[PDB]
Amino acid sequence: APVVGIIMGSQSDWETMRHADALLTELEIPHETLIVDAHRTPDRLADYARTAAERGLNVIIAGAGGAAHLPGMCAAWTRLPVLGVPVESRALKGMDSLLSIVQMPGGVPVGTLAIGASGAKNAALLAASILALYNPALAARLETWRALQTASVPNSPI
Amino acid sequence: SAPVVGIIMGSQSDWETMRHADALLTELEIPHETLIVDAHRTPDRLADYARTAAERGLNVIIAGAGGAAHLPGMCAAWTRLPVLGVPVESRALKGMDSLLSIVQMPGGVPVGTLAIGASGAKNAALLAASILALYNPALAARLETWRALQTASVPNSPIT
Amino acid sequence: APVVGIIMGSQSDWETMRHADALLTELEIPHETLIVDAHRTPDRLADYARTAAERGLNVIIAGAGGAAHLPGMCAAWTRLPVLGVPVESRALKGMDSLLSIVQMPGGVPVGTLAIGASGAKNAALLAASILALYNPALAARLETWRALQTASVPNSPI
Amino acid sequence: SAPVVGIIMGSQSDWETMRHADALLTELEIPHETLIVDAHRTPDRLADYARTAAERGLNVIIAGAGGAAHLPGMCAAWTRLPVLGVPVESRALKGMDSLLSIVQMPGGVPVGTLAIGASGAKNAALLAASILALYNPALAARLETWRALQTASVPNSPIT
Amino acid sequence: SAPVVGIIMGSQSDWETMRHADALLTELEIPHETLIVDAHRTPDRLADYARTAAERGLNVIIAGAGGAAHLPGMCAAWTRLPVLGVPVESRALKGMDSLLSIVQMPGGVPVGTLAIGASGAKNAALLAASILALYNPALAARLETWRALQTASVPNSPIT
Amino acid sequence: APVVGIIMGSQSDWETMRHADALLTELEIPHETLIVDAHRTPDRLADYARTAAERGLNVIIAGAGGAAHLPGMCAAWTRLPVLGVPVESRALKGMDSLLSIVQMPGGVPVGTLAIGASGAKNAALLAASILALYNPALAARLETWRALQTASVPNSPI
Amino acid sequence: SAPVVGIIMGSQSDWETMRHADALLTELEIPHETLIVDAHRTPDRLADYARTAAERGLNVIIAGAGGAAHLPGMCAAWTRLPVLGVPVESRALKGMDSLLSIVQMPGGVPVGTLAIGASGAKNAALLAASILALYNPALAARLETWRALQTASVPNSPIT
Amino acid sequence: APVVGIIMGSQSDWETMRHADALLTELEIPHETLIVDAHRTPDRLADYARTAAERGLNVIIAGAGGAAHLPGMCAAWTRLPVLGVPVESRALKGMDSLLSIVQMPGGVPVGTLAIGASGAKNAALLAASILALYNPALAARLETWRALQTASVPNSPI
């Protein structure tokens, strides 16, 4: 059963959010990958978020661009930790996505990652670091992942 | 006397800004209701308000919010009514965050956005009036009188 | 007779404003589509706006980029609701268009939509939501449009 | 004594900034008129002022406005005269909106834009003087005297 | 009573903001330690704190910093633990610099970033609680009670 | 003899400043077009500006990008009106060019035009509007130019 | 006692910021001179100062300016010496204009730019010290002592 | 033995930092060019910086993009002058790189250069101007370099 939910606003978000899917797949974390649009499918959003904990999700990763309300509205309906990924927008380069995600009021948090693929990748890693706290096997795979990242960095340019 | 415009805001601190919308609708004798709806702390309250607005007789919604301002956009998601958005000025980013959170809606779910702060609150009410004025000749007449005074009230030189 | 007027500053705005034309065409809203340049044809602008109501227009949609004064100056001359679309600019990505449109003073409103095609599309939808208040047929077509938008969203990426 | 420069501003609150342009033209003995013109609340007043400026003997227009500052640009649309624009500082966006609304004019209709605030108002007047100085030797001489004092008035070390 | 969350900040002046995280963890009865770690003036102190956090029993780190805010990111570089970042508001750039310095981490080393200022400090603590709540039923129950009060505490109309 | 000087920082500025050259050529304004780099040739700059009036220049048009100090430093050495054109920069899209040109202190003015080709074109037109004040022939050609601009605007998109 | 660092600023109002550079050089016993040079009002004064700096024995120049801050860049244009730039905070754009005007120099003429405001003034002096420290063992020793105190002076927990 | 160290966060930084390598090569300054990633190899960073002075480095040039912590963390561990180059980022065009580098607190300086290749080139020139203070030969080569830069600027566009 999936323990992380990755959800995004539209098909065009998949270009960014696939980086999150891949990383969870790489660490062997059971997850589901869905499209949920806060503005065009608000009821779908409410249902998804309000039932998330009881279906066994531990962490939700939500990605959106523009006026990105998806992560925030999700956090409004579950006590689960929600991680937000600002998808890069065509005009304002994700600066709108960023400010509409990261600036949540006191009381309803969203842990925000970088604009773009990097944030998608880091949402996945953060969700792993969270799960790692109570799954010792995953904890080990994660330290393997980090150590390899570290050791793989070249010493000079080409 | 049943309301035809709904003014809604995220918090009491938003009222400093949204009171200008309230006052202005009162001046034009437009029946309205004024409520607090917090998109994040009372999300179920938000859904129900927005999905029933039309069957309750509302024609226009004016929504004010700051920061990550999701109140106007989520409202529009649940009503076919025109939703007007007012970016409340925020302390750190001076309402820039409020603005981009309101105005940058996707194709398919509109919010008509006004200026940051009191200026926008006032213009929301004026816009909602221009909208209602399309079917109400009395309000249309009150509105052109109002516009005309504004014009005639502008001085021709400054005071030193 | 047209009940919405779509006006833009130049031929290059048509790339963005065509999205507004299409949507009004799709909802079967009688409209006219014109070029009106606030700076190069200021008299044309004044005439257009000052005669708009008496020709039967209910809503005006105005699009411009750069120092975008077209929507604002239009609103200065009619009591009709004016909707503004910030066209994306080459250097500042429509941020200049946006600030010169949305920041109208108290007393003369412009309802502003997103930068770019999305805003053009939403100006059209907003004008429809306005007309829908007193045309029951259009109201029905519009709920059809919204419901289809909602139901069409996929549940997963490809 | 007929004016050759027109200073125009959107509101009384703009005068806090535009008074520096007024004072400076007075210092250089340049005949000017100072008026309020609101592009949005008195648009017909704007058209008429701008379209007649030249036949009335004006050579340069200095226009100040804030927010969505459309006053300088719309002016230039209706006169062949050089129009100079001063971005008045706005409360939320600190004049950034004023600036982009003035300076980003299309090819074909220029506005020479100065800095945000008093600095710009002062420079508008100085620029309009440099412009008039091309045909007026007396004013040209007054202007180089003025520049020369400014230079000599700068100290060589700070005060602790 | 051994701490499971570490709150760390760059300076005493950051405490004006980070105290909200401290208070909130105290309210939810979450054992934490609160320390000063300056990434630039005490870099060796930073490395050692971060590399030992896990073997000391910490589960979540909350880090606050302003300006060129390198404290949260460098922390994450040295622990496998989830690191949460709070952008402290800066005097000139209003925390915008703090924000971009925290949130724009490369793929491979995450920091979960909250809003600029007190809002973010409060949300960091709430997030760290949601994280601990996944394994602690008592804290999970305290947390949903807390969320529920927040909701019920929102008024239905403003005060004029 | 030239009465307007167009000067730019580098060869790459010519892509933008050529629009200024063309317009002066079109209105038949005697002008010179030069490269003057405030940072790499500061002495050339001082000479040019400090001798401008006595060579008969009436207006200087200066274009630069990045930390654009060329217009400002020019204004520091002549009582002639100086017009500044922010050339679009690769990273910050001319926002750096703009702020380093337009924000001159009280006492030394630069009349600033838009970022890019539009500003280059408008610097040329502004210089024309200035010269037009005391050359009646040029004044007439300029009203012809403006009237044609106005009358040429189409009434609809294609 | 002949100066090896020159601190120069555009105006007396810049001294509020640049005094921190002055004080800090005094603390490290680095001989310096402190002068006003206005790139726009005293441009000939600027050229001469910069072109003679090296033959007068200066090794590093620290230049402070705000707004359209052209002082550091134009200096570098006329000396082969390392020029360090300090963006003074401006009233409307909060030093953002100062920053982009200083830091965005073309390839070929460098200015090492520090933070906006007092922080940057202080760091300019510290940087110029690190530079002089490469040839002066006494100053190098004074500098590492100074760095070491800074580190040891950082507290381990905040005060509530 | 190398007297300047050029270090960068990743292979993709080499596109920008190569401009620094070339210039030091052109002035015949003994230097080393390395990849050092503050986030993925924090220990490598500490070692490098903390041993820099005793290996004979006089100046360090550090380049990074995004949340660019590399120059700052480097400065935290050596009393050597550190020069920082903001590498242009994909979304925010190096504005994030810039603010995370230039805004160092009082007490730990980084001398910051322009966003992109220009800054890389200027970091190299600045390091040269620093070394030039106590190497008379290099001082001469540097004045040659500057004089040639100055004399090479054309007088007109092509």
CA B77 – CA B64 distance, rounded (Å): 16
Range of the domain at G144: 1-160
Tell me the torsion sign for CA atoms F36, F37, F40, F41.
Answer: positive
Return the structure tokens found at G53. Answer: 């700096």
CB spacing of H39 vs E74 below 8 angstroms: yes
Q: Which residues of E touch G154 (CB under 8 A)?
A: 36, 38, 41-42, 45
Helix then strand count (H, E) for chain H reads 6, 5
Q: Nearest Cβ partner of F91 from H115, H153, H155?
A: H115
Answer for the pair A95, A84: CB distance below 8 angstroms, yes or no.
Answer: no
Mark out chain E residues that contact chain B at CB-CB < 8 A. 89, 94-96, 115-117, 119, 150-151, 154-160
DSSP letter for each residue of C110-135? -EE--SSHHHHHHHHHHHHHHHTTT-
Among D8, D100, D123, CA closest to D61: D8
Cβ(H83)–Cβ(H12) below 8 Å: no
- Say whether the F–A interface has 3 or more Cβ pairs within 8 Å: no
- The DSSP code sequence of H9-24 is SSGGGHHHHHHHHHHH
DSSP states along chain G: ---SEEEEESSGGGHHHHHHHHHHHHHTT--EEEEE--TTTSHHHHHHHHHHTTTTT--EEEEEEESS--HHHHHHTT-SS-EEEEEEPPTTTTTHHHHHHHH-PPTTS--EE--SSHHHHHHHHHHHHHHHTTT-HHHHHHHHHHHHHHHHTS-SS---
Neighbours of C34 (CB within 10 A): 15
* Mutate: best of A115, A122, A125, partner H, most H CBs <10 A: A115
Instruction: Name which of E117, E151, E154 is nearest B36 (Cβ-Cβ).
Output: E154
Q: What is the CATH number of the domain that holds F94?
A: 3.40.50.1970
Size of interface A-H (CB pairs under 8 A): 42
Chain F residue with minimal CA distance to G104? F67
Q: What is the DSSP string of F81-99?
A: -EEEEEPPPTTTTTHHHHH
List all residues 6 or more positions away from A120 whose beta carbon is below 8 Å from its beta carbon.
A16, A17, A18, A19, A20, A63, A85, A113
What is the Cα–Cα distance from E92 to G88, expressed in whole angstroms? 10
Q: Which residues of A touch B (CB under 8 A)?
A: 9-10, 38-40, 42-43, 46, 66-67, 69, 72-73, 75-77, 89, 92, 95-96, 99-105, 107-108
Would you call H153 and F41 a contact, using CB atoms and an 8 Å cutoff?
yes
CA pair distance F151, G5, nearest whole angstrom:
62
CB D79 within 8 A of CB F142: no
Angstrom distance (rounded) from CA H121 to CA H119: 5
Give the residue from B61, B119, B130 with the most C CB atoms within 10 Å of its CB, the best one to mutate.
B130
Q: Which residue in chain D is spatially nearest to C68 when comparing CA positions?
A: D101
**Close Cβ partners of D72 (under 8 Å, ≥ 6 residues apart):** D63, D64, D65, D83, D84, D85, D86, D102, D111, D113
Residues of chain G contacting F102 with CB distance shorter than 8 Å: 68
Chain centroid offset of residue H149 CA: 20
**How open is the CA angle A108-A109-A114, to the nearest 5 degrees?**
150
Helix H136-151 × helix H117-131 angle, to 10°: 140
Chains that touch F (3 or more CB pairs under 8 A): C, D, G, H
E149/B35 Cα distance (integer angstroms): 20
Radius of gyration of chain D (CA): 16
Contact G110 H117 (CB under 8 A): no
List, in sequence order, the alpha helices (H) in E6-117: 15-27, 43-52, 71-76, 96-103
For residue E81, is it left (φ>0), alpha (ψ between -120 and 50) or beta?
beta
Q: Do F94 and C90 touch (CB under 8 A)?
A: no
Pair G60, G131: CB distance under 8 Å: yes
Quickly count: other Cβ atoms within 10 Å of residue D28's Cβ. Answer: 18
Nearest to C111 among B109, B119, B127 (CB): B127
Q: Are C72 and D73 in contact (CB under 8 A)?
A: no
Nearest CA in chain H to G57: H133
Q: What is the resolution of this structure in A?
A: 2.7
Residues of D in contact with G36 (CB under 8 A): 154-158
**Nearest CA-CA distance, residue A123 and chain H, Å:** 16
Separation between Cα atoms, residue E58 and residue E61, nearest integer Å: 7
Q: DSSP H helical segments within chain F, as ranges?
A: 14-26, 42-55, 70-75, 95-102, 117-131, 136-151
CA gap H115, H68 in Å, rounded? 12
- CB-defined contacts G:H, below 8 A: 112
Tokens 């405001």 correspond to G117
Residue with tokens 């004008």: C127
Q: Determine the Cα–Cα distance for residues D65 and F53; give it in Å rounded to an integer.
A: 32
> In 3D, which of A49, A102, A55 has the Cα closest to residue A75?
A49
Q: How far apart (Å, rounded) are the C-alpha atoms in residues B29 and D6?
A: 41
From the list F28, F40, F35, F43, the residue with the least C-alpha distance to F7 is: F35
User: Å from E3 to nearest chain B CA?
Assistant: 30
Distance of CA F146 to the CA centre of its chain: 19
The size of the B-C interface in CB pairs under 8 A is: 112
Looking at residue D146, the DSSP 8-state letter turns out to be H
- The H-or-E segment that residue B9 falls in is strand B5-9
Question: What DSSP line would sit under C56-78, residue for residue?
Answer: T--EEEEEE-SS--HHHHHHTT-
Chain F positions in Cβ-Cβ contact with residue G74 (cut-off 8 Å): 38-39, 42, 69, 73
Cα separation, E86 vs E89, whole angstroms: 9
The rounded distance, in Å, linking the Cα atoms of C61 and H61 is: 53
* Residues on C contacting F at a C-beta cutoff of 8 Å: 8, 10-11, 13-14, 17-18, 33-35, 37, 40-41, 44, 66-67, 90-93
Is C144 exposed, middle or buried, given 0-12, 13-18 or 19+ CB atoms closer than 10 A? exposed
- Residue G86 φ then ψ, to 5°: -120, 115
Tokens of F127: 């210089």
Cβ-based neighbour number of residue D124 at 10 Å: 32
- Chain E residues touching G159 at Cβ < 8 A: 12, 15
Using a CB-CB distance cutoff of 8 angstroms, which residues of chain G are in contact with residue E92?
89, 94-95, 116-117
Q: Which residue has the tokens 């209602």?
A: B132
| Best residue in C36, C90, C93, C100 for a mutation probing chain F (most F CBs within 10 Å) | C90
Between chain C and chain D, the number of residue pairs with CB atoms below 8 A apart is 95
User: Where would I find the beta strands (DSSP E) of chain E?
Assistant: 5-9, 32-36, 60-66, 83-88, 112-113
Q: Using only C-alpha atoms, what is the Rg of chain G?
A: 16
Query: Sign of the CA dihedral G146, G151, G157, G158?
Result: positive
Q: D119, F105: Cβ pair inside 8 Å?
A: yes
Q: How far F60 CA lies from chain G's nearest CA (Å)?
A: 17
**Closest CA relative to residue F60, chosen from F71, F76, F46, F45:** F71
Task: Give the CA distances from residue B133 to residues B32, B33, D39, D99, F39, in Å, rounded to whole numbers and listed in that order.
Answer: 15, 18, 24, 34, 60
Identify the DSSP state of C7.
E
CA pseudo-torsion sign D46, D51, D56, D59 = positive
Residues in chain E with CB shorter than 8 Å from the CB of A29 are none
Query: Where do we find the tokens 């709540």?
Result: E133
User: Among residues G111, H15, H17, H103, which one has the least CA distance to residue H7?
Assistant: H17
| CA-based end-to-end distance of chain E | 47
Structure tokens at D50: 């701008």
Please check whether residue H77 is in contact with residue H22, taking contact to mean a CB–CB distance below 8 angstroms: no
H chain contacts of residue F66, beta-carbon cutoff 8 Å: 114, 118
d(CA H117, CA H123): 10
Distance CA C95, CA D99 (A): 12
Q: What are phi and psi of E153, to 5 degrees?
A: -80, -10
In contact, G39 and F107? CB cutoff 8 Å: no
Contact F118 C66 (CB under 8 A): yes
Nearest-CA neighbor of H88 among F91, B125, C101?
F91
Count of domains forming chain G: 1
**Rounded (to 5) percent helix, strand, coil in chain A:** 45, 15, 40
Distance between CA atoms of residues E111 and E82, nearest Å: 7
